[PDB]
Design an enzyme around this catalytic site. Structure first.
Site, PDB file in Angstrom:
ATOM      1  N   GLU A  63       0.839  -1.194   0.000  1.00  0.00           N
ATOM      2  CA  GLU A  63       0.000   0.000   0.000  1.00  0.00           C
ATOM      3  C   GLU A  63       0.874   1.244   0.000  1.00  0.00           C
ATOM      4  OE1 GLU A  63      -2.980   0.388  -0.666  1.00  0.00           O
ATOM      5  OE2 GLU A  63      -3.710   2.284   0.219  1.00  0.00           O
ATOM      6  N   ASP A  91      -2.017  -5.497   0.969  1.00  0.00           N
ATOM      7  CA  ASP A  91      -1.365  -4.404   1.678  1.00  0.00           C
ATOM      8  C   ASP A  91       0.068  -4.738   2.056  1.00  0.00           C
ATOM      9  OD1 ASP A  91      -3.527  -2.495   1.752  1.00  0.00           O
ATOM     10  OD2 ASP A  91      -4.497  -3.718   3.234  1.00  0.00           O
ATOM     11  N   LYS A 117     -14.490  -9.334   4.100  1.00  0.00           N
ATOM     12  CA  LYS A 117     -13.208  -9.404   3.423  1.00  0.00           C
ATOM     13  C   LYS A 117     -12.915 -10.849   3.039  1.00  0.00           C
TER      14      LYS A 117
HETATM   15 MN   LIG Z   1      -6.347  -2.919   3.345  1.00  0.00          MN
HETATM   16 MN   LIG Z   2      -4.767  -1.826   0.228  1.00  0.00          MN
END
Ligand SMILES: [Mn+2]
Ligand SMILES: [Mn+2]
Ligand SMILES: C[C@H](C[C@@H](C[C@H](C[C@@H](C[C@@H](CCN1CCCC1=O)N1CCCC1=O)N1CCCC1=O)N1CCCC1=O)N1CCCC1=O)N1CCCC1=O
Ligand SMILES: CC(C)(NC(=O)OCc1ccccc1)c1nc(C(=O)NCCn2cnc3c(N)ncnc32)c(O)c(=O)[nH]1
Length: 178
Positions: A63, A91, A117
């Site tokens: 990220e 991430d 998620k």
């Molecule tokens: Mn995330």
């Molecule tokens: Mn992300």
């Protein structure tokens, strides 16, 4: 707006600019969708604290990079280690455990966002780790990757940000906007 000024005086400038770049890069303007601006900064800072936990070179940060460069690093990690290329950009990558990590910061209980998620992944190879603004966390196979002290630091930070928003009477719209 009040939220924009608060985001700018609450988070560090590198984080604010990366959030601004990432939102405009996906068509959203930080000066309008200010709640998503605060949340992009929060997710960024949580990701950086996470990567800071552990050893020096344990985590490869995904990220915060530009889209094509982020995928460049994932493809490189994949051909390096042999893991499968996730269909959606994660991430982090954990060199100690050999797995990509998706980090989430929610305001609706670790069960709801964890469930969303995990269904979004639909490829269970990516490790999942959710933090909340209430001090709670949920992670895949109950494996929380880091030691207790680093996670407690993240949680404390999240709760201090929540109280700061309420002190400016911003917490309510922020909690209802997710
Ligand atoms: Mn995330
Ligand atoms: Mn992300
Ligand atoms: C590398 C560089 C930027 C890094 C950002 C990231 C920030 C990290 C810095 C740490 C040290 N601390 C601790 C004290 C204050 C500080 O600052 N933390 C962690 C907490 C908040 C914060 O800020 N880290 C980690 C390694 C060094 C560094 O800077 N980024 C940006 C996205 C990906 C990435 O790795 N890059 C790369 C090219 C463009 C750019 O800007
Ligand atoms: C909170 C949010 C945005 N949901 C979120 N996003 C990610 C993420 O990785 N996004 C990859 C790039 N991306 C795709 N759509 C995007 C968009 N609308 N804004 C910015 N970036 C976007 C997380 O990891 C996470 O925890 N939360």
């Amino acid at each position: 707006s009040h939220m924009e000024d608060f985001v700018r005086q609450c988070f560090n400038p590198m984080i604010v600019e990366l959030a601004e770049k990432a939102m405009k890069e996906y068509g959203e303007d930080p000066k309008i969708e200010t709640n998503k601006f605060a949340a992009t900064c929060t997710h960024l800072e949580v990701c950086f604290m996470y990567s800071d936990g552990g050893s020096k070179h344990r985590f490869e940060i995904i990220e915060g990079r530009d889209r094509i460069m982020a995928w460049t690093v994932v493809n490189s990690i994949c051909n390096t280690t042999g893991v499968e290329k996730p269909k959606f950009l994660p991430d982090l990558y954990d060199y100690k455990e050999n797995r990509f990590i998706e980090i989430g910061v929610t305001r609706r209980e670790v069960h709801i966002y964890y469930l969303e998620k995990a269904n979004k992944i639909k490829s269970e190879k990516t490790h999942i780790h959710i933090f909340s603004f209430t001090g709670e966390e949920m992670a895949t196979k109950a494996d929380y990757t880091l030691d207790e002290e680093s996670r407690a630091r993240i949680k404390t930070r999240l709760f201090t940000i929540r109280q700061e928003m309420a002190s400016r009477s911003l917490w309510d719209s922020f909690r209802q906007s997710e």
